[PDB]
Each structure stands twice: as structure tokens, then as C-alpha cells.
Design the sequence.
């Protein structure tokens, strides 16, 4: 399949070079897979989701997204126009409030919820979780992310936006999950992106167009925007039978575009997520 005039980030994940505007992908498009978006919620009624999104859990007075951040991340995973995996099922878990903040105990409860809740859903091709959040180092937060991965879920997490070594942030610093940095349309590391030996991969993170609350759209930047490109790619590859939840991070790194990014500090991987689709 071919999507003309796509957002730059979708075109980049299906290309060997920067500067193109068509997204190429196998028409199976993640059907039969599931992606949990653990964030501020999802506006499931947005026309871009076509009935494939629903809220499954909240820790606050409402399950609605009063912020917009979680709706934007879900759109990069699986909306019709702005998503990587256009036929996946999306499940929302609201662990952040409408100001975008949340206690670490609530975030841990949310990750334990997904590890059990997958047994109540129909996901024959496999299960993914997208975590666009983070804070300072916590051994308890890292252990929760490791349990979720062990249970058979592909876990993707944001590196953080401090222009620093990701070793000092959680869940970014957990070894067994997929830690994602951010790049821009000219193949530079984003100026805010964290780095270090704990990173596994980079994805598009500067000026990313996706869905917003109120049935609208907008372009915003961060490692939060890079993370759902990788979660959507994992769902797409599991549907095609190329990999499984336990080895998807290794498969994505083995098949990535190598040595193409600028301003990568010595010691950090120079790997950009790529679907390797041949029309």
C-alpha cells in the first residue's frame, strides 16, 4: 500500500533516505494485534480512530483526556491518517491527570494492570505497551516495567527530554525494555533528546503531526512522539509474523538504518527505526 502526502515521520520509517513524503506498508497493517497507551487517556470518539479505540482503566474522576498528550500518542500508533499500524486495536490506561502529572505508585499500578488485562482481550498476533512518560531514577518503577516485559508484552519507553544520559531516569534506564530517542526531518538527533548506552533505537520526534482533543489535529515535539512510532512498528511486524513480543526490540535494532544520524555522542547507538517494506 502507499499513502501520499503523509506526515514526514511515517515516510521516514519506510525509506532508506530522508526528504520523501509517501508512506509504504503491507496492507495487513497490524490487524489482530493490540497496543496499550499508558498516558493521559484517549478521545476514543475522534473520527480518525474509526471505532478501534476504547478506554479500559482510569485512576481519576473521569477516563476522558482533558490534556491532549495521550490522544496524540495514540494517533501516531494507529489513527487512519497519522498512524503506523492503521488496523490495530488501541486500549487507553489513564495514569496521568489533565495537567500531565502523576504519582509513581499510580504509574506502577497501571503497568501491573496491563500485564493482567491482556488475558481479557483478543490479541492473537501479540500485545504492545507505549509509555510516553518518566521521571528520576526509581528501582520500583524499573521493576514494574521489567515485569510487564516478562509477562509477554513488547514495552517501548521514552528516553526523556533533558539533553543528558538516560541512565538517571525511569523507566528509561530499565535494561530489558526498548528505550527510544528522538530525531528530526534532516536526520539530526533532536536537540532535547537524552542519549547513552541504555538507548536501543531512535524514531521521528521533532514536529510530529497527529490527533488532538476536540476532534482536531496539531504538530508537537519530544521523545514522547518518537516512542509511539516504535510501538506501532512492533505491532505491524508481529502481525506479519517477522517477530514476537520477547525479541521485537532486538529485531528492530538488527533491521534499522545504520550510521545515518548526526550529533550522536560516542557510546550511543546510531540506529533509526525502519520497516524494510518492498512494494
Sequence:
Amino acid at each position: 500500500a502507499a499513502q501520499t502526502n503523509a506526515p514526514w515521520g511515517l515516510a521516514r520509517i519506510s525509506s532508506t533516505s530522508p526528504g520523501t513524503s509517501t508512506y509504504y506498508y503491507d496492507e495487513s497493517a497490524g490487524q489482530g494485534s493490540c497496543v496499550y497507551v499508558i498516558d493521559t487517556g484517549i478521545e476514543a470518539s475522534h473520527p480518525e480512530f474509526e471505532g478501534r479505540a476504547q478506554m479500559v482503566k482510569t485512576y481519576y474522576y473521569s477516563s476522558r483526556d482533558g490534556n491532549g498528550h495521550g490522544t496524540h500518542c495514540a494517533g501516531t500508533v494507529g489513527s487512519r491518517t497519522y498512524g503506523v499500524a492503521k488496523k490495530t486495536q488501541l486500549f487507553g490506561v489513564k495514569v496521568l491527570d489533565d495537567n500531565g502529572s502523576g504519582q509513581y505508585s499510580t504509574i506502577i499500578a497501571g503497568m501491573d494492570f496491563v500485564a493482567s488485562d491482556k488475558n481479557n482481550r483478543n490479541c492473537p498476533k501479540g500485545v504492545v505497551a507505549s509509555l510516553s512518560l518518566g521521571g528520576g531514577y526509581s528501582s520500583s518503577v524499573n521493576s514494574a516495567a521489567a515485569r510487564l516485559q516478562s509477562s509477554g508484552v513488547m514495552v517501548a519507553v521514552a528516553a526523556g527530554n533533558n539533553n543528558a544520559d538516560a541512565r538517571n531516569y525511569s523507566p528509561a534506564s530499565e535494561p530489558s525494555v526498548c528505550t527510544v530517542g528522538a530525531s528530526d526531518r534532516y536526520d539530526r538527533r533532536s536537540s532535547f533528546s537524552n542519549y547513552g548506552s541504555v538507548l536501543d533505537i531512535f524514531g521521528p520526534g521533532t514536529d510530529i503531526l497527529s490527533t488532538w482533543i476536540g476532534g482536531s489535529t496539531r504538530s508537537i515535539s519530544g521523545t514522547s512522539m518518537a516512542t509511539p512510532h516504535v510501538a506501532g512498528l512492533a505491532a505491524y511486524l508481529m502481525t506479519l509474523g517477522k517477530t514476537t513480543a520477547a525479541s521485537a526490540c532486538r529485531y528492530i535494532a538488527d533491521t534499522a538504518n545504520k550510521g545515518d544520524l548526526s550529533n550522536i555522542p560516542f557510546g550511543t547507538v546510531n540506529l533509526l527505526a525502519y520497516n524494510n517494506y518492498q512494494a
Remarks:
- The chain is about 25% helix and 20% strand.
- The first helix runs from residue 8 to 13.
- The chain has one domain: 1-279.
